Assembly symmetry: C3
Homo-oligomer: 548 residues x 3
């Protein structure tokens, strides 16, 4: 009054419904009741503040601005400044303690949020305001900036009790060298971590308990002092089913990842180690998948394995199925071309352009396929059936030429207990053929015991008459076989040089077995001198086959 509007509360006045006056601070209040005689400066019953968002409406929706302000709540709602100077830890904590906030903590649109004290997320996840490059340009636009010089953070993790989300985040530690300040603690059971950039800290990601259903992707993890990702697993729960994809570890003083204990069934792919002092370290790595790794340079170390498994025979069952690039000091115990050890191999299948190989932890056996053919780690190559119960022989087929139409002809071999052959075929005359590796067997009267081949031995029956005979228990037979008798050493083991002439006679299995069915138990060799008298060589060879 008169030429401006201003009226303060007057205890003599009765204010009607909708009457407006000013509080002593100048803010306008509106009476919501008839006959209002209450002083709004001490009692707001029957009054509302007109500048409150509960009294402001969006006519598009016919709701209050108060309701619209529930759409997105951030740390800015709780007084966070994000100004690169002011400690926002209390505001972050108030956010996490509030009944109004959702599953995650959110940053405001723009801000470098300083934290000088530990924040207990109380099970809330963490969502930032962008996943930036490792530069001041991005830190100034949007990040969490933990004050590593703060005495209350020394030896501690900046965020504890994180929920199942860390995403869309840039977070650094400033002035924390030597202070062992780690960034965030998150439980290993059920996590999605994606699109993060972490800078400095001791341990960047501290996994609590053990991995299970833990997914981690698209992370730039720079300058950690101890580890990018650390999992102590103090109760030895055994980590499983963790995925680690698209991670760039750069210029860390320690390792990329440290598991103090055991990891099973985890997957690692498209990982970069650039100037780290260690790759992935674990006690036990079992049935894990490893894809592409790019390992280039070491910070201060001279030589490090990209994967370091400390337990004896504790690296096994793995799939090393991406190329591992090694430059500037990195080594590998998983290459297909690596020679096997008798024990403590990094067990698994290894597949890359280097080779296709497979090895177990506790044995020398290793097979490798290369463009040239095959290599073995134990000087042995087995060929058998997939079924352990099948006891048939194998047949090998091999291209040896063409048939008359010009198509490839694959010839079949034979390798049974009784026969070794390699098939062939004459397409001119249309006849099968074969090449033979016969049984060879030598008689020598100077042997302490008779030589035996496959259940046959040679014995003297009488002067000039020798039996190539079956020993007890040999029930196998010769069927239509080939027979060659070798050269005699006469008179002594050295031989005199005199000769002799041989003939043979078959030994039947039953009466008529040979005559009628070309089945024989064995055969006799008869030796005679130039006067056709029976004579005894000191030593002689025979060669024969058990089939045609």
């Amino acid at each position: 009054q008169t030429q401006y509007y201003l009226k303060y509360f007057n205890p003599e006045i009765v204010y009607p419904k909708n009457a407006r006056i000013m509080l002593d601070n100048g803010d306008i209040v509106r009476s919501t009741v008839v006959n209002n005689t209450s002083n709004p400066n001490v009692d707001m019953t029957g009054w509302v503040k007109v500048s409150s968002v509960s009294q402001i409406f969006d006519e598009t929706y016919n709701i209050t601005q108060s309701v619209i302000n529930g759409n997105l709540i951030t740390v800015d709602n709780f007084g966070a400044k994000g100004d690169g100077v002011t400690d926002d830890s209390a505001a972050f904590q108030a956010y996490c303690d509030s009944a109004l906030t959702g599953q995650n903590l959110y940053l405001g649109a723009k801000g470098r949020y300083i934290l000088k004290n530990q924040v207990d997320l109380k099970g809330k996840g963490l969502v930032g305001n962008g996943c930036g490059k490792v530069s001041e340009f991005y830190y100034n636009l949007g990040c969490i900036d933990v004050d590593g010089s703060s005495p209350d953070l020394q030896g501690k993790t900046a965020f504890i009790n994180c929920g199942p989300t860390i995403q869309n985040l840039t977070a650094r530690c400033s002035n924390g060298a030597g202070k062992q300040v780690s960034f965030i603690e998150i439980d290993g059971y059920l996590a999605n971590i994606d699109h993060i950039t972490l800078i400095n800290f001791y341990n960047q990601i501290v996994v609590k308990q053990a991995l299970v259903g833990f997914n981690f992707t698209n992370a730039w993890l720079y300058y950690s002092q101890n580890a990018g990702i650390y999992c102590e697993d103090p109760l030895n729960r055994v980590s499983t089913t963790g995925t680690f994809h698209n991670i760039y570890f750069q210029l860390g003083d320690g390792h990329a990842m440290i598991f103090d204990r055991d990891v099973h069934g985890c997957d690692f792919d498209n990982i970069i180690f650039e100037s780290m002092n260690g790759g992935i370290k674990a006690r036990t790595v079992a049935h894990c998948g490893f894809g592409k790794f790019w390992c280039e340079n070491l910070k201060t170390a001279t030589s490090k394995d990209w994967l370091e498994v400390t337990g004896a025979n504790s690296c096994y069952g793995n799939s090393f199925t991406g190329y591992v690039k090694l430059l500037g000091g990195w080594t590998s115990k998983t290459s297909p071309t690596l020679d096997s050890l008798p024990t403590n191999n990094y067990g698994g299948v290894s597949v890359s352009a280097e080779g296709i190989s497979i090895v177990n932890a506790g044995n020398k056996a290793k097979m490798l396929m290369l463009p040239s053919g095959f290599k073995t780690g134990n000087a042995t190559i087995d060929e058998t059936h997939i079924s352990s119960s099948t006891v048939t022989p194998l047949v090998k087929r091999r291209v040896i030429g063409a048939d008359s139409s010009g198509a490839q002809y694959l010839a079949s071999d034979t390798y049974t207990k009784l026969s070794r052959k390699w098939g062939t075929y004459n397409h001119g005359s249309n006849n099968a053929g074969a090449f033979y590796a016969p049984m060879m067997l030598t008689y020598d009267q100077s042997f302490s015991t008779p030589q035996n081949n496959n259940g046959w031995k040679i014995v003297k029956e009488s002067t000039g008459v020798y039996r190539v005979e079956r020993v007890s228990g040999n029930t196998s037979v010769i069927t239509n076989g080939h027979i060659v008798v070798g050269s005699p050493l006469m008179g002594s083991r050295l031989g005199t040089g005199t000769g002799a002439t041989h003939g043979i006679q078959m030994i039947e299995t039953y009466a008529g077995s040979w005559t009628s069915y070309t089945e024989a138990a064995g055969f006799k060799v008869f030796w005679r001198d130039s006067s056709n008298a029976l004579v005894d060589p000191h030593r002689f060879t025979v060669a024969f086959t058990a089939t045609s």
Copy 2:
């Protein structure tokens, strides 16, 4: 009265531009025109409500709060309470029917949003307010909570006509046991589903039509009654190019995934089945990739395959290239070590620490590489050229020792139509050498037909004279070959035991072929008794080579 501000409309007054009065409800209006005589209680032409966000400005931008309220719109804008009690289905529908809303439906920051009626998304995608763990703690902070006890949802899907996005979402069905309430229907063509947690429901994800360009990742799918993901494909369009990564299926009464029909070119990786009653089931699985699976325990079943393909020879072309962990009843038809069947194999390549194998659906053939060597499923191993047209022989090289420098010496074999040899070398004297598997061929006058090896047979020419000769059509030759004659059976097939002495004579291909060029068609064998008289054995063997 003059001690407070309150003036209602008066029809006798002319209100100037910018004059303020109160509506009968107490809200202030401002005249926007000169000479205003319109009653704002019945006609707002020429007036504006001052408490509207269209009349409130952010001076930082010189725009109205109305404009700023277009940045993010959620179901809260349409009256959703998210209070764990109130049915918000009408508010969700209003959101989807609004001209103001964008591609997706969004939840507000905090809320447990109850739905008691089906929501038609009208092509909008769905974005939640967090991907939480499977616990009341997260449901209370942020989720959709479908009332499965609602009669209007029995046997139906809660959300229909979903757009190409489902993300950042926690959704449960409460009190829906036995009511067959499914969560969401989404078209198979062009989808991105990521970072979701779904709890209960009959089918959690209902795919409409068939997959193509369908990407699904980072999902915790717990307690489904029938399937985590169901694709009927009623028109048999054939699903393709679907990706399924980082999915944790736990404690479902049915399967993880059910395809009633056919799936081609899809990828499955880092999947967990924990206490399910079934894995992935399909009619046909063709040219799909399968990576790491962790399969642990069954809910009520005793034995289930992790992958179940029902069609005969309908599992083929696949890549089973991650380790499949099997615990507590899970089985597999895809292990590298599994024996092949004559038909209905789960066709594909299988690569893990268990082995490297390859098999087709409709045939017994299967090759397996292990640390020890090789195993075959059909008792056969072929060795040939990659080209089907090449008809040269192969050469196998094998390490047999060292050369004089101490380097590995790989010796070469020979396997042609006419020669079987294994090479060697003497590095002391610097001479090549070889081991031989000769052709063997036996004459027997008791044979019904002459024995033939590779186009050669033995025939009697005259008393004591035999030709080892080429049959009609055999145009192959012996070049500088080795010849051994075997032992004679005289007088009868059994043999008398008398002997005989042999000599040979070559059979030339043309005049001088042997004498000048060591080429022969064959050779004659001459047999004589101890008086040097020509004599006829009943049966005898020869062994010879076609090369030196």
Copy 3:
């Protein structure tokens, strides 16, 4: 003027603290100072506008609406209309130039944002308002719509200097056919691109410099005129460590991806080419991973390789470890079954249901494993040790039958410098056995030089007496060997047909070596006629072994 509220500034009046009056435009101002005599129409010192959000409070937080409006800032804050008509480029630029905005540029909830001029993102990333299907329905709800008919955009990229984020975005170019308008330029070092849909444009994604730590996933890239993704790398920095997953390239006039130069250590998986005119093209592709590709139809081309590498021997070290589906004209140079070339193979390991193979770029060698066995590209298969220094022989073991318990019996072979054998065993009599490939060696007086096998030759000592002897430098020995003498050609090279009878005598290495220890240097062959007189064959064979 008593029946409404309106008072303008009066220079005669002294306004107390909290007094309210109207500016000449009608907006209310409140005095913040005592004794206020300043005209708020020309000087706002000592006054505040009551309709400003700095003067509106959310009592839930006790903060101003101004603070809450810092939670999310979009292009709408800078006057963008998103109305499908108005050019918003100036608003987008103002956003990027503002001190108030964070790491990324954001779109408002709903809008089709027209851009007629280039926007310089100034290092900000780009976040849209949804990743939609390729349809007007989604463009109308939320997208960037670049006006390709704008002369100022011809031959240019619409967005330059993008930060490390492109996500949640739909962007099209309208009316740009032939105008070479590209969408966005982003640096190759440190990027996360995900959940995007791009429609038309010349190059959709223009990578500046070279890839490193570049992650790209979940993209629908339709109708590009030249390339979905283009990387010039003008300085030949060499691209590395880029990931390209879940990309659907459809109906482009050019290629999916074009690298003008070199790519190392990159990963490509779950990619679709549908009616493109080219796949991935690069100069050099080194140590890259390729997973599943679905290649179906060409737009106007007749035949195209899914991967096209132009440099000679510049495709090497790769992993082709997913199935590549080829339909409607697409071809491949990476199939396991493809025959090798002598040079310019697409080098790498290839693993799918088609086969398991490995090949290098610059050599014919290629090994392939199939269900049937093995195939080689160079007519050769090697078998050796993984270690290059090991010089022992190998032993091959092969199933040939069963032992007496019915278990598989694997027999061992022998292949040394001196011995070729295949083992067997008689489980009836419990005796080992063997099949033999002996050394064969022929004497021929018509040879210009003696035949030598493995350091042994045959020489005439005297009439009828021949030495099978070691040549100079052969220090190897026969130990308990088998000896077979072959058939004599008498009188001439052709032979007369007369015979002869042989005997042998060993040649010792030292006195008693044979007699006592069965060690020999060689052996003599003695030939005699039917009168027992020494005689000289023209030619004869021997066969012997160096071991028993």
